[PDB]
Amino acid sequence: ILSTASVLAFERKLDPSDALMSAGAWAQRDASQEWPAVTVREKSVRGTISNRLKTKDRDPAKLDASIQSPNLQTVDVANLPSDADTLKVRFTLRVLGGAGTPSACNDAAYRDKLLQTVATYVNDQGFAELARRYAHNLANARFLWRNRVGAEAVEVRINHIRQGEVARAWRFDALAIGLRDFKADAELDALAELIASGLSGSGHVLLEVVAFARIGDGQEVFPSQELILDKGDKKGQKSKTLYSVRDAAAIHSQKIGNALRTIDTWYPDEDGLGPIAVEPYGSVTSQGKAYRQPKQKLDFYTLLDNWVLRDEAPAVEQQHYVIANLIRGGVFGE
Amino acid sequence: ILSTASVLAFERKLDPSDALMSAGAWAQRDASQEWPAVTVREKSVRGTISNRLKTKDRDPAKLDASIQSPNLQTVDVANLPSDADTLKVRFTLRVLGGAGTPSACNDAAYRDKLLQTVATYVNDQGFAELARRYAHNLANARFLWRNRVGAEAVEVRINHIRQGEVARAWRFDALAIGLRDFKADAELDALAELIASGLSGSGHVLLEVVAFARIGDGQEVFPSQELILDKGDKKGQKSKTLYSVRDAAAIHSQKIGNALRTIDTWYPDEDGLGPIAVEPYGSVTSQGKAYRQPKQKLDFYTLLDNWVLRDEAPAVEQQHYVIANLIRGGVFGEA
Amino acid sequence: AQICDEALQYAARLRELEPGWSATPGCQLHDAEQLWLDPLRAQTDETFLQRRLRGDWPAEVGNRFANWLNRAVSSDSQILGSPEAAQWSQELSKELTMFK
């Protein structure tokens, strides 16, 4: 009998970089090669005790009167200069190709069957529905996470770097293209064709993405906050640390990958909520939900194990979901 | 009766070094002597629970609460700088010579018979095919394992260090030279003649191999992940440790040695897939298959016991394979 | 400062003994400083102790520490006094409530 392999290692296609941030004035976006980078400052604030107080075994009103007395915190903040109203976010993106070919597989018969199934998918249908949604998520600047909610003009410039030059430069208005529906455009299907050629393996694809946003003069930008687990003893810590490449505020590359990866509009309880990041057991931990629970038979693992082993080929949307999870990569097994 | 020796120790030929990684820009690769080294850095990331859940004895409420809530993991990463689009990886290689002489034996008559067999192989045909395939594995940048699959253009320079400086420098386009086709070029068989003269013992050959790969601005490069055995496989408190020599990301020397040894185009299955690494019971544990199993009589031990004891010579490609195994070196010998 | 951080080091290096102590004898001085040497928050496991977070320990530990430093440091300037006791008491009390 053919069973799934115990070691399965799928490499990451659509490799992003750390997206570095700088600041400048709008309409000077063309000469934005020398804009000063946004630096992370550390500031100390004094505030009130603003949390639900524990009232289990403390004093009723004596030691629980930590109110009427401030608390003193020391956090980080990234700001624009006072004479700059435009955040510029720049990163690179490689599109590798060879999606369903794992870098490690124990069962070789399973590897041959999986490669046959993936090549069957790519030869009956191109990489035309995945790369279109990837080019859409590149088009609207969803990689600006909280830097997109209050902007009046978001413009994305995408260069296809050929040797050391540019070979094709796209320029999209990221606010006309919504974050929830995938329309068609004369400049967007060309980028979808280029990402499809990179995904199938027809050519080496390297893109430089740079997005400008008008937020305002001297306002606050939100780079990636670092993950530091603070402890309950010896309190009075920092409790906010923003990530930085060398004296420059930046976004984590996995955050850019998550905002480029959110193409899943096929989950059984959607009526127009919008795309979700393609995950096995596709879940938003910030929103608290977990769509495609294994109670329903729409998990990545059940769909893959029914497609490859039992040859129960799913619907075309679920095929797009499974191949998007293979493009993301990961560790599968026993 | 001439049974095989009880101990057999063959020292490693083609001894590589730990390949250091640094970063810089393309079209200034000639002044790549002061390029800043790629440094490994730890990062804590937040992901979702994405693995096959053990739903055998656990309650469903804890399982879907686990897939709802995130999980936080600390891994290492080595990236290029934002102005650097080229990874420069440098190692040194010695080829030794005297591939047939073992370093340990128990039966001296077996030692003389094995040396006679290797000498008949050598004066029948030199180390031309093996050094041709080794020079091919040096020319195309197979030692960049995951640093090659998305590179736009790879250039591999190979210097022959005569005293402390170069005496012959080759420069190859590592993407035009494929990973499976063994072609013929003038610089390629010149380097093959050098490696053959080093393997025959007719000269001291030390090479410096420096490979530049154009990956892109600020992209992730991949050194060797360290095997942490019985010190950190308990909690999962550190999921991915990378290998660094001295404040510099580096590739393991035995990984470069496995990359150069990927010349075995001969095995009883279909040879159209490309070469595999030369090992007895030729095994790709990442691909999970063992070519040259002991069932089909084409493993290294069966061919060696047929060649030396019973004096039946195998096919010429199979004796190419077993002499490549003797170049690899190892521990052989029955009880 | 060196004396109170030595007391903090004594509280930290005696956190390496065991989580769970008991009503082992000698409780004539051992009710306020009983809980300054923390119960490691792992032997508890169901909140069997109600005065662990009541606030009873830090002012009393600072008071009895400053009384120890009063009776220990008394030069030819013989009396040291109660306001100095309250000052060193509130000093150690701030550095003990700094833990949470």
Side-chain angles (χ1 to χ4, degrees), chain A residues 1-27 29-31 33-53 55-56 60-61 63-229 232 235-238 240-334, chain B residues 1-56 59-142 149-229 232 236-270 272 274-335, chain C residues 1-15 17-21 23 25-26 30 32-39 42 47 50-53 55 57-59 61-75 80-100:
Chain A
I1 197 64
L2 175 61
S3 46
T4 175
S6 50
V7 171
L8 261 174
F10 278 80
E11 319 189 308
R12 170 185 48 233
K13 273 80 205 169
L14 276 79
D15 275 309
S17 178
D18 292 333
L20 275 75
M21 298 153 53
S22 64
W26 192 266
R29 312 153 287 164
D30 294 331
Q33 288 93 349
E34 62 286 350
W35 277 11
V38 170
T39 47
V40 172
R41 195 182 67 253
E42 182 198 276
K43 69 172 181 181
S44 278
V45 292
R46 152 155 163 268
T48 65
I49 315 290
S50 299
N51 44 357
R52 295 205 217 249
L53 311 168
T55 42
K56 175 196 171 303
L63 279 85
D64 262 342
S66 45
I67 321 163
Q68 319 146 355
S69 45
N71 59 333
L72 274 55
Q73 300 294 103
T74 313
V75 292
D76 291 335
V77 53
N79 294 144
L80 273 75
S82 86
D83 45 355
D85 61 324
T86 293
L87 172 72
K88 162 197 172 96
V89 172
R90 188 189 162 266
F91 68 99
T92 53
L93 179 80
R94 275 158 65 217
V95 184
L96 301 190
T101 305
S103 65
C105 202
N106 285 357
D107 206 305
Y110 181 78
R111 161 157 179 155
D112 291 318
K113 185 56 177 303
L114 169 69
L115 265 182
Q116 168 185 337
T117 301
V118 167
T120 295
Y121 168 77
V122 181
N123 290 62
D124 62 58
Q125 284 169 354
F127 274 124
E129 201 53 50
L130 296 186
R132 194 178 61 88
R133 290 161 180 251
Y134 285 147
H136 265 281
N137 273 344
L138 269 177
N140 46 37
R142 215 193 297 251
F143 43 88
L144 274 76
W145 275 82
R146 214 191 148 181
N147 309 322
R148 207 201 170 266
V149 58
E152 65 208 342
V154 192
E155 179 184 52
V156 187
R157 304 186 164 189
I158 298 170
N159 313 339
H160 172 231
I161 294 179
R162 187 80 264 181
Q163 285 286 330
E165 299 152 21
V166 308
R168 177 74 196 277
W170 290 277
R171 187 168 309 181
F172 304 113
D173 190 23
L175 285 171
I177 310 168
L179 289 187
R180 42 190 54 241
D181 280 338
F182 303 95
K183 307 178 187 61
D185 198 7
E187 294 288 316
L188 267 174
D189 300 282
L191 180 57
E193 282 163 32
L194 188 134
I195 296 171
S197 89
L199 270 179
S200 45
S202 170
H204 159 73
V205 163
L206 169 67
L207 308 173
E208 172 186 2
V209 181
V210 47
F212 309 97
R214 291 195 85 123
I215 41 175
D217 305 298
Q219 284 257 317
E220 176 158 339
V221 278
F222 314 99
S224 278
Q225 187 182 350
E226 275 183 9
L227 196 142
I228 302 301
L229 282 80
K235 276 305 289 177
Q237 323 194 21
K238 180 166 302 308
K240 177 155 185 177
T241 316
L242 294 170
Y243 172 65
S244 68
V245 202
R246 313 157 305 203
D247 309 328
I251 316 177
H252 288 140
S253 88
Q254 62 260 11
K255 209 172 177 58
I256 314 296
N258 189 74
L260 258 68
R261 219 168 64 241
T262 167
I263 68 176
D264 197 6
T265 75
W266 318 288
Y267 44 99
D269 289 338
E270 188 184 3
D271 56 353
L273 271 81
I276 299 302
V278 282
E279 313 265 348
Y281 311 97
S283 71
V284 195
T285 74
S286 68
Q287 217 183 351
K289 272 294 294 177
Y291 317 101
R292 313 171 151 276
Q293 275 181 40
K295 303 294 171 53
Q296 288 85 241
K297 309 306 288 176
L298 287 184
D299 184 31
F300 162 69
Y301 290 112
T302 80
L303 285 171
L304 176 81
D305 292 328
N306 293 351
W307 197 7
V308 176
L309 302 177
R310 267 84 69 187
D311 284 329
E312 312 172 4
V316 193
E317 307 99 17
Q318 317 305 309
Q319 286 183 24
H320 294 332
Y321 168 72
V322 166
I323 299 301
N325 262 319
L326 294 192
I327 282 175
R328 157 201 191 266
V331 178
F332 322 119
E334 169 174 23
Chain B
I1 184 53
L2 198 58
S3 87
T4 188
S6 198
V7 303
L8 276 172
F10 280 88
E11 309 176 349
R12 165 188 56 239
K13 271 77 192 170
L14 326 185
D15 213 338
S17 158
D18 271 326
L20 295 201
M21 312 162 68
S22 47
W26 197 267
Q28 50 174 29
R29 310 147 276 160
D30 304 335
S32 51
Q33 276 75 237
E34 74 296 343
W35 273 12
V38 173
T39 77
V40 184
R41 51 173 206 90
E42 184 148 301
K43 54 157 189 172
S44 293
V45 303
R46 166 177 181 191
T48 78
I49 291 290
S50 44
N51 47 10
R52 292 187 187 256
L53 318 161
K54 306 297 125 187
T55 76
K56 315 311 168 164
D59 66 281
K62 211 144 289 185
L63 293 167
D64 53 6
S66 196
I67 74 172
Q68 277 162 14
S69 46
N71 73 316
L72 320 181
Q73 299 280 342
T74 80
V75 292
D76 283 19
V77 60
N79 314 274
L80 300 181
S82 301
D83 55 355
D85 68 320
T86 303
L87 172 75
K88 165 209 161 91
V89 42
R90 167 195 180 271
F91 68 101
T92 60
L93 183 84
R94 267 190 315 165
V95 307
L96 292 183
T101 47
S103 42
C105 274
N106 280 135
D107 190 317
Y110 182 79
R111 167 162 190 144
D112 290 270
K113 188 53 179 298
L114 177 53
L115 283 186
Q116 173 182 330
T117 319
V118 167
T120 45
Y121 174 78
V122 162
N123 73 78
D124 269 7
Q125 38 174 20
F127 286 99
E129 179 70 29
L130 291 176
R132 191 177 68 94
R133 288 160 179 270
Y134 286 145
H136 270 62
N137 266 14
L138 268 175
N140 58 264
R142 210 194 277 271
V149 307
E152 179 205 304
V154 190
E155 174 209 347
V156 175
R157 313 186 162 187
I158 293 161
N159 297 340
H160 180 210
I161 300 179
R162 193 72 262 179
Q163 285 295 136
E165 49 198 5
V166 313
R168 178 67 216 276
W170 292 278
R171 175 179 310 198
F172 292 110
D173 181 30
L175 282 186
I177 308 170
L179 287 184
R180 35 186 56 189
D181 187 24
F182 288 101
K183 57 170 61 181
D185 182 37
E187 318 286 330
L188 262 172
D189 70 334
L191 175 62
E193 272 154 19
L194 182 70
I195 298 177
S197 88
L199 280 169
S200 303
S202 163
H204 164 81
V205 179
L206 163 84
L207 306 181
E208 170 187 0
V209 192
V210 179
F212 316 99
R214 193 161 209 175
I215 308 182
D217 301 318
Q219 282 291 329
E220 181 170 337
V221 292
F222 313 101
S224 310
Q225 178 176 347
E226 268 189 333
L227 169 61
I228 305 299
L229 208 45
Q237 75 276 7
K238 176 55 179 287
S239 163
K240 177 180 184 181
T241 303
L242 297 179
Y243 174 69
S244 44
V245 175
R246 267 203 313 260
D247 293 329
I251 316 183
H252 281 153
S253 74
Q254 76 263 20
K255 210 171 169 56
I256 318 290
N258 183 257
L260 299 194
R261 219 167 65 243
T262 317
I263 71 169
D264 198 14
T265 321
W266 319 286
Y267 49 88
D269 300 273
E270 173 53 60
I276 65 166
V278 176
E279 31 256 24
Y281 324 112
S283 293
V284 296
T285 58
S286 58
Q287 219 180 349
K289 202 205 288 292
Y291 312 94
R292 309 180 159 271
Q293 272 169 347
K295 298 188 305 180
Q296 306 98 333
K297 312 298 183 304
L298 277 179
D299 58 82
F300 165 65
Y301 290 105
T302 300
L303 293 169
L304 194 72
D305 293 337
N306 289 345
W307 201 8
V308 179
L309 309 187
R310 302 147 185 86
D311 217 347
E312 53 181 0
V316 53
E317 300 94 9
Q318 305 308 304
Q319 69 196 56
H320 279 318
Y321 157 75
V322 308
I323 293 300
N325 264 309
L326 298 189
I327 289 172
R328 163 197 187 266
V331 177
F332 322 115
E334 284 172 4
Chain C
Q2 282 161 39
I3 286 174
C4 58
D5 60 53
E6 176 61 278
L8 290 161
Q9 285 157 54
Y10 173 75
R13 79 184 73 182
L14 265 297
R15 221 199 274 186
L17 188 156
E18 283 295 329
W21 290 357
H30 213 194
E33 277 144 339
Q34 175 91 49
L35 269 184
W36 156 59
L37 315 177
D38 314 277
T47 319
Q50 74 279 42
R51 63 178 184 275
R52 176 61 204 104
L53 47 90
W57 75 98
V61 161
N63 276 22
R64 196 164 66 239
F65 156 76
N67 286 12
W68 166 84
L69 200 148
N70 276 15
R71 305 163 305 120
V73 192
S74 297
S75 171
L80 188 56
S82 61
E84 292 90 344
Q87 206 269 345
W88 294 319
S89 302
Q90 69 99 37
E91 201 261 359
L92 191 67
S93 200
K94 296 200 315 307
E95 307 323 295
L96 280 191
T97 70
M98 195 66 74
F99 281 171
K100 266 169 55 190

